[PDB]
Structures are given as C-alpha cells and as structure tokens.
Design a protein around this nucleic acid. Structure first.
Ligand code: CA
Ligand code: CA
Ligand code: CA
Ligand code: CL
Ligand code: CL
Ligand code: CL
Ligand code: CL
Lengths: 173, 173
DNA sequence: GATCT
DNA sequence: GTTCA
DNA sequence: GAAC
DNA sequence: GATC
C-alpha cells in the first residue's frame, strides 16, 4: 500500500498472496470440533458477500465459533451469538460509505474490503458449543446469550411493557 | 438542534430538561434487584467521565446490567460482561475526534457527548446475575462470557501457543 | 440498505 | 488516550 | 459494547 | 460483533 495507515483496520488485504504466511487449516488443533458450514462468495458489484449454504441443517443455529479459510489458509477466527447468516449481514455493513459515515465497525470494514479484494470463495468452518441452562427471576433460559445480555433483554422488555417505550439513552428500536 | 440528523445517535442531549419525559428510577419495577454501584462525574475539560466508586467490593465484578440515572430520571439501561470501570472507559471512547475518525461506536459517542453536555453527576445502579457453570472441551467455566465467546478465546489462546501469532484477519493484539 | 451495541 | 469486535 |  |  502507499498511504500511512493510522491503524491496522485501514490496511486492506490485496490478494491471496497476503495469506502466504498464514497457518494451514490442517494445522488447526481444534478442527475435529468444526464442520464446513457454508461458503462466502464475494460480489464486488454489490459490495457484499453472498452465502452458499453447505451444512444446511445448521444455517439457523446460533452461538458458534467460526473459521474463515481461503485456499487452505486460516484468514480469521471469530464468533457470534447469532447464526452465521447474521454475522455475514454484519460483515456486509463494512462498506466504504459506512466507514466514511463512521457507522460501521472497523472490523467489518477491514474484513469486507479484504475479502472483496482477495476475491476468492471463503470456506466457513463452524463449531456450536453446548448451551447451559441458567435462571433469571425464577425463569429458566437456554440460549447463546451471556447472562448479563439476557438479563438486560428481559428487564428492558418489561420496562417497555410497563412504560410503553425504552429510556431515551437506549437508541435502538 | 438545527441540522438534519441522519440517525438517532447524532442527536446529542443538551440539558437535563431533555430528560423531563423519562421514567423516574423510583418507578423502575426491578429496582429491588439493583444496588447503587458508583457515580459518573463529567469532566468537560478532559472530555471524559470520572468514577466515584460506591459499592467498592463490586467495582471489579464482571457481568452486570446497569441503569444510568440523572436527577432521578432513567437515562439508559445497558449491560457489560466486564466490570463497570471498563464499560466506563469504553464510554470514554465517545470523543468527538474518534467519531470523526469513525473509530468509536455511535453508542459511546451519543452517550458520552450527551452526559458531558447535560453535565450532571450520574448515579449508576447495577445488578449482577448469577453465572452458570458450563463445560467446554471437558473443562468447567463460570464467568460472564457467552459460551461462544469463551470457546473462541480458549481456541484462539491455544492457536497462539501453537503458531505464535493470531491469524492475519484477527487485527487486535 | 444502514446503524446500534 | 485510541481502536477493535 | 470489548479491548489495547 | 448485534441489530434494525
Ligand atoms: Ca470473536
Ligand atoms: Ca411529559
Ligand atoms: Ca445492553
Ligand atoms: Cl452475549
Ligand atoms: Cl419498569
Ligand atoms: Cl479518556
Ligand atoms: Cl491451533
């Protein structure tokens, strides 16, 4: 690249040659816990990633660790409390315009733009950890959320039921 | 305000009168589950919030739901898998410069700037849910993380021990 | 399509 | 103080 | 909202 | 990274 990056997220990868020093997926010690869930297909015209479902039964499963692999090289390990389709939706927020707006995460910008430029199909490996049962206010939950996030959700919903709206500082609808 | 806001996070609150239709903390239905944790003190000169620790034994406790209260009014309900100190430092990322850079969340920007402009001490009430025990790869955990986030941390730490670095797409140190 | 947490 | 997820 |  |  030719500019002085102020930060790592501004250094967009340029080609699969930038992955030359990465670790092979074969050398991933936890790989027996992972299965090939889906693939990502870069759509440069529409500045987004499309999905080809592979492990169709798991496409709506939530709470996963994922590995993005390009030509056998590990590009990224991440996670989501949502299904993979929503995590990809989130990556599709990494558009140039939104980075300019300051409304996307630097992570989503870095990854979306890198994958678009590398322009290869990305294999997505996933592991879905078992979810514990937990209690909050004499009610039991089993899901992908942290207990604090779930507690907040119940409390905010109740608040809206009781008061007809969220607090002014809770911006999201 | 006078500009055409493109989004809700750009509408910074200007004074306590902007809270006049908010719900009083005393009418909060879950108030019996919450206890005063700390106060936040706006420091406009330094464009940040300071902390007055109250519930000292809980200042390093992780996994909470919080309520920000200003002159009796509920401004916001939120949560953190970290201690309140770290959530506050995250709010301290809501600086004008960082918003211009696009490197802070719109949430942190909206809240920090609103709290600085209102310029009142904020009472922080908190509830710490009980943490369930759970198993990953035959090891037991009991913490504030979702199972997917913990699983990814465990996997990534092992990845670093094996290959001495993180994947290139994992930007954070 | 776009922002919020 | 400042960016990443 | 989590992390450096 | 979660959400609308
Ligand atoms: Ca992750
Ligand atoms: Ca009124
Ligand atoms: Ca929250
Ligand atoms: Cl969570
Ligand atoms: Cl309520
Ligand atoms: Cl600061
Ligand atoms: Cl490994």
């Amino acid at each position: 690249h030719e500019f002085m990056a102020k930060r790592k997220s501004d250094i967009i990868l340029k080609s699969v040659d930038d992955l030359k020093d990465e670790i092979d997926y074969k050398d991933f010690e936890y790989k027996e816990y992972f299965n090939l869930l889906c693939e990502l297909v870069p759509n440069n015209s529409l500045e987004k990633l499309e999905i080809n479902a592979i492990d169709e039964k798991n496409m709506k499963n939530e709470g996963l660790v994922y590995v993005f692999v390009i030509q056998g090289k590990i590009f990224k390990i991440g996670h989501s409390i949502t299904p993979i389709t929503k995590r990809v939706q989130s990556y599709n927020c990494g558009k140039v315009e939104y980075r300019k707006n300051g409304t996307c995460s630097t992570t989503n910008y870095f990854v979306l733009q890198s994958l678009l430029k590398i322009n290869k199909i990305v294999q997505v490996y996933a592991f879905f950890p078992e979810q514990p049962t937990y209690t909050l206010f004499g009610k039991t939950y089993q899901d992908s959320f942290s207990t604090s996030k779930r507690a907040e959700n119940v409390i905010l919903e109740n608040f809206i039921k009781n008061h007809n709206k969220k607090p002014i500082g809770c911006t999201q609808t």
